[PDB]
Design a protein around this ligand. Structure first.
Ligand SMILES: Cc1csc(NC(=O)[C@H]2CC[C@@H](n3cnc4c(N)nc(Cl)nc43)CC2)n1
Ligand SMILES: [Mg+2]
Length: 347
């Protein structure tokens, strides 16, 4: 961090944080990076070990309408103990509780205890009443948004042109309508969705590793909105196939075989349903199975919208992102998986 901003950070923490931060000099202010990106940047600010009395906070610099919303949403989830505590909010960013933890790894998503908890937390999130638009316009609204951007994009480099040409050759505008007809035919309750429920957005809390049902916290609610519940679950299933930790180009690995098996999907929803609908436990065996089977159809259909949306999203990112990542390859992997899924489903 360039030392000019190492100043601002100091002030933000001097002004906004209580106790020993109030009477802190600039010569005792440690702040390391946590993640660059020139957008939604994260830093760890802390005291010297020498200063008696929180000792560590996270600072989030925004970088690049939706600012009002994100802020209220974060504040609400903090108030309700569903998110990190909010300690300071300003134009450039916010100071948040630092949660001692690590992000999950992809392989961990399939661990029965982890899956069960993720299902529980998503269910809780889905139960939240939030002060936002309750109409489910997000999913197609966003896909149309990205689609229009996609059709406008021109790349100078030659292989990017060929990659894009291959993607445009699927006839994306017609394929979107194909998905619309399928998804408008597939009922799914509208709820407050995380919309980006990937391993990277799930913290395993330090010293709770032994807890069976209470070791996780969903974070990063950048894409959260009222949306079809099938999207949140289908999208999460899809994330079983993608590992963003790979250290070589394109900086992800995709594995269609790691998509949850029927059994793994039933285990997830088995834990989702009681958590979401409290009386669910008390239905007949017959009735539970009906709901489960319907739910498998629903989530596996919406899974198609996860490939499609993130596919489009990734083409745009290839134009405009500063992040070192193989977007065009990722987009192609999402479309591969999209068609593979349509084939598996007979749609
Ligand atoms: C150099 C360095 C020191 S620590 C670090 N990375 C990490 O600790 C991981 C795991 C914890 C995670 N984290 C903890 N609190 C939060 C929070 N409030 N919001 C978000 Cl979005 N993430 C949070 C950050 C990413 N890098
Ligand atoms: Mg993943």
């Amino acid at each position: 961090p360039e030392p000019r901003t190492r100043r601002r950070a100091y002030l933000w923490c001097k002004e906004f944080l209580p106790g020993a931060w109030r009477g802190l000099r600039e010569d005792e202010f440690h702040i390391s990076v946590i993640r660059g990106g020139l957008s939604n940047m994260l830093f760890q600010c802390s005291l010297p070990d020498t200063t008696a009395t929180p000792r560590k906070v996270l600072l989030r610099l925004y970088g690049a309408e939706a600012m009002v919303l994100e802020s209220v949403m974060f504040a609400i989830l903090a108030e309700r103990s569903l998110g990190p505590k909010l300690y300071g909010i300003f134009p450039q960013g916010r100071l948040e509780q630092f949660i001692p933890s690590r992000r999950l790894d992809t392989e961990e998503l399939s661990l029965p205890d982890i899956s069960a908890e993720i299902a529980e937390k998503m269910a809780t999130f889905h139960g939240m009443k939030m002060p936002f638009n309750k109409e489910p316009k997000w999913l197609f609204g966003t896909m149309e948004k990205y689609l229009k951007e996609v059709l406008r994009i021109k790349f100078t480099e030659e292989s990017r042109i060929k990659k894009l040409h291959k993607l445009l050759s699927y006839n994306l505008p017609l394929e979107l309508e194909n998905l619309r007809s399928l998804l408008e035919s597939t009922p799914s309750p509208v709820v407050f969705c995380h919309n980006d429920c990937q391993e990277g957005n799930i913290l395993l809390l330090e010293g709770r590793e032994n807890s069976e049902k209470q070791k996780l916290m969903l974070i990063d609610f950048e894409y959260s909105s009222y949306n079809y519940r099938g999207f949140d679950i289908g999208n999460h299933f899809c994330e079983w196939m993608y590992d963003y930790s790979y250290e070589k180009y394109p900086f992800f690995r995709a594995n269609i075989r790691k998509y949850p098996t029927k059994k793994q999907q039933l285990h997830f929803i088995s834990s989702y349903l009681p958590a979401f609908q409290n009386d669910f436990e008390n239905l007949s065996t017959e009735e539970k199975s009906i709901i489960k089977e319907e739910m498998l159809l629903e989530v596996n259909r919406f899974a198609l919208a996860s490939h499609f949306l993130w596919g489009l999203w990734s083409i745009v990112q290839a134009k405009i992102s500063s992040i070192e990542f193989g977007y065009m390859d990722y987009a192609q992997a999402r479309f591969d998986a999209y068609f593979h899924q349509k084939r598996k489903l007979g749609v």
